[PDB]
Design a binder for this molecule. Sequence first.
Ligand SMILES: Nc1ncnc2c1ncn2[C@@H]1O[C@H](COP(=O)(O)OP(=O)(O)OP(=O)(O)O)[C@@H](O)[C@H]1O
Ligand SMILES: Nc1ncnc2c1ncn2[C@@H]1O[C@H](COP(=O)(O)OP(=O)(O)OP(=O)(O)O)[C@@H](O)[C@H]1O
Length: 1127
Amino acid sequence: SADSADNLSEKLEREWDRELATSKKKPKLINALRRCFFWKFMFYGILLYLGEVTKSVQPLLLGRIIASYDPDNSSERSIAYYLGIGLCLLFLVRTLLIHPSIFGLHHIGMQIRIALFSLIYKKTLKLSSKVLDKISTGQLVSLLSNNLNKFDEGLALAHFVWIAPLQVALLMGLLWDMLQASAFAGLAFLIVMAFFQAWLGQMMMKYRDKRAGKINERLVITSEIIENIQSVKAYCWEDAMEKMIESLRETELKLTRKAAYVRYFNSSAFFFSGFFVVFLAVVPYAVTKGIILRKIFTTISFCIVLRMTVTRQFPGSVQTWYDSIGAINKIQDFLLKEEYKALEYNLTTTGVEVDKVTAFWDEHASPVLQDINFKIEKGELLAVSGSTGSGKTSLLMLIMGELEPSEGKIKHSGRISFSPQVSWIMPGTIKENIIFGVSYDEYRYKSVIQACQLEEDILKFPDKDYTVLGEGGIILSGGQRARISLARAVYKDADLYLMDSPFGYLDIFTEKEIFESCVCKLMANKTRILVTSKLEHLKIADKILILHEGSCYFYGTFSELQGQRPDFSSELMGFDSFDQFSAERRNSIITETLRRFSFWNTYFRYITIHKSLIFVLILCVTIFLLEVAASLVLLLFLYYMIYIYVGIADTLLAMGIFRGLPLVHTLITVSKTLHQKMVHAVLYAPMSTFNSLKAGGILNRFSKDTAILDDLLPLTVFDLIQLILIVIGAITVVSILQPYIFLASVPVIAAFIVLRAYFLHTSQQLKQLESEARSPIFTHLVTSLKGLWTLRAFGRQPYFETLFHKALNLHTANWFLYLSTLRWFQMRIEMIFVVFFSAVAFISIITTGDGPGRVGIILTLAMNIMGTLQWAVNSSIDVDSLMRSVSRIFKFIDGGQMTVTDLTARYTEGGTAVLENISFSISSGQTVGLLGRTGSGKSTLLFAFLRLLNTEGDIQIDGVSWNTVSLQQWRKAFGVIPQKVFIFSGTFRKNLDPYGQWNDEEIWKVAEEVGLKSVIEQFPGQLDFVLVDGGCVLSHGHKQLMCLARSVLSKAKILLLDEPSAHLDPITSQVIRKTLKHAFADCTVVLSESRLEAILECQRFLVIEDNKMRQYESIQKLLSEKSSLRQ
Ligand SMILES: Nc1ncnc2c1ncn2[C@@H]1O[C@H](COP(=O)(O)OP(=O)(O)OP(=O)(O)O)[C@@H](O)[C@H]1O
Ligand SMILES: Nc1ncnc2c1ncn2[C@@H]1O[C@H](COP(=O)(O)OP(=O)(O)OP(=O)(O)O)[C@@H](O)[C@H]1O
């Protein structure tokens, strides 16, 4: 196997394609995979087997070593000496064999994961357009992310399904004094514990899945709040929002608490089993014959080995192996989906023809396009219009071959260049998007970008052609994104060009220029099809097509339309001034014209009350498990004293469990408190201070830190308690038996501490790389999915495959480095442990072990100490991560006439002053407003009033200085509607009234007053309707009206309007102006405008530049000074 994506893919593709091609009904992915996997997997598997079997040998060697100190036979010093050497070598050898093999298995898991991802990516790009709208988008994201961190670890235990029975059979077969079947008492106990644990684990999974759903809901509300803190504070909404967080948190905790107990008992059960395998193991020796130390010591070491292979190594592989298989099956189901059918290019024609085409998207469809017919000559212009939904763009999908006809033929000449309704961001270099996938030629490039009028905006970009367009499209406005899409479609040389919604939400001035610049001249003599709403284009076009309800309304010459459907034509022409209508209005006009011319609980409470019931229930489980083991003992089918002693052990263990329950209760309580305090602290936080993270670390730390406290503190703490108790005992005993061991062990612990510290520093830094390399794999994926229509149209598939592989190689390189440093670290740790072991074995061998039982116990304690020690190393690592998280969390928590005198503001106490020494007056009830350049800090005046800035000077509102008024009422006076309107997700009643203070009747009254009554009636449920995704179903004008309704219900006196005109079309902007003037007849309205035409309705003006301002009492004085100062 290879170490890179390209090679890994070739091999997987060859086997997959060969089997898939060999069409034996249902070819399987699993077979393609075993043919890759098996020849490496099996080798690491056998090496691990050989490594593990060492544990089944070591106790035998000790029994003989112990015997050498017996008074029996002879004091063969030389044998004790050499056997001791052999024992320490067994430790060294398995260390040297096992770790490399584990590493190799992880290497394999990684290689397979990469091969699987590349296969899936290739498949998504070839999917049929029909199934494309049935496959939930969340499923493809989870298809790749769900096993991202599981698949590659899982192979580590896979060969244990195979090893486990070999070691169980051996250890069983090695039992000394086998017929007195202590073997069954032993196994019956362990077997029962294993099934108990399996069941418990299943319950754990049930809780994880349900909790995950609730987590996503909490996270969504959380980020919604974080990115809009200014509106929450401005609204003085505050604690209502805090309560929304609380209800989501409470829901998660109820589920978490139950999950926590599952984890608690799992761990205490583990402890319990330790005690009993040892206890039961000595029942033979108490029962008749008595004790033989030679055999007792040997017996216990073997018992320990069975416990671990039986209860942990085996079931871990079973669960892992099973889940891995299910994941593969899901991948296969995805791969076996209908394909995009390739278009056959030919030299049949020069034009475009459609022969009686009838077609539809899916079964059960009524949207069947009927009897579609075309004959377009080379170089002709086709203009198409019609009702929304009557195959306005679905026609294009037939043209490009995305949708097959059910009947009829489609003929085309050559290659097609397509520009979709919705622009594809293509994150990356802007020049490259314009000329993407093709050679750069300044002749053509300049001609296209100039003709498309891109220079007007692109030359303002900081790196010009090399300005990179990042995620979110932070560089371009929607009309600009559209403009680039056109330039891209045009730059590509094609025989046929398809323009989807080319008007681009652009200003009519540029719309005209682009049509003539591009449609007429740049595209001259090309075969063109335009989607359009403008009658002028139809007049110009050689062929006119109008669609309605799945069929042709009209197809032919412009004058033929008028002669054959004159009523349709006359109704449209009544709106003669179509250039004055925005696309939205043009669409409404045709839609109407065209449709008009149709042609447990009782006891749970008692369990909480009576702790004696809890004790009994704990004891009941213990009793039950021992009785079940008895059922397994009866396997022999094909004493009172023992009964008494085991009964005693059960009672003692039950009390031990009972004592620790308050810890679970305490743990849930603590994480709840921390989450709640952090939220409170962020809401009632100073402004500017949060700008240290700028919402990045705020969201990431808030989300991640809570998650780790909940999953790890309740887990790692119990392991630490058990490990701590074990080491205390181990050291105490050897220190007493032989003080030289202590002398020897002190430097050993010192060695481990130093290496650990160095390691963690570096590995913690490397961990950052996984996130850095991981994020872009998904950004790449999403971008490719949205761009699918053009990736196929322009033949760019291999370009993107190349990019995808480079991203994978980056990720794997960092992932791999992280893995490698960890493995090296663990190897070093184990070797240090191996060395002190040898030294200890010899301290005991060398000294006067004339009372041999003391020799025996030192040797077995040392031999079996390594299991606990490996856990201890890992637990210390987790602890350091937890403490670092705790610190990160802790860092956050441990006047009608408005009179402004000498006001000054900054974004920090250092930084820069965004405003200095401004004085300004607003007469009560006066309409006033602001003028200034974009980015002149317009919003910093509003924020200065809302007290969101580091500030100086005297502002008198509601008769008093801000200096004597707390933020809530100072801000309460101000009803502000920002350009970026905040929409709270949820029920409209709460969105409008998060406090529940207004009645439904009152809410409706205001909805009527502000013009939103029809809007709320339209949404099903009305007040109960749930609004989602930032108001993805609302006009931004509606969002502004919702804000208005809030301002009037809130009884604000100062109304602040942040350029409504920035986004709202005048057809509605005037409606809101009328509406608010009536609503605010007794209030003072302050407007911040971008144009003189809007500011014009104000009586007093504030003109701001360079952190200074000029106050005018008349628009004329403003204009006289503005002309002099128009700079
Ligand atoms: N792949 C698809 N499978 C099924 N239905 C589809 C698919 N793509 C689009 N549609 C739907 O079926 C119709 C297809 O027609 P088309 O895409 O031409 O509509 P349009 O008038 O261009 O749409 P709009 O302007 O609302 O975006 C639409 O009304 C749309 O809701
Ligand atoms: N708290 C802040 N800290 C740092 N920079 C800020 C802060 N608030 C805004 N800015 C920036 O400084 C300028 C402030 O001007 P303001 O926020 O009034 O701009 P605008 O013209 O309303 O901007 P837009 O059209 O992007 O909404 C902007 O150019 C913006 O990038």
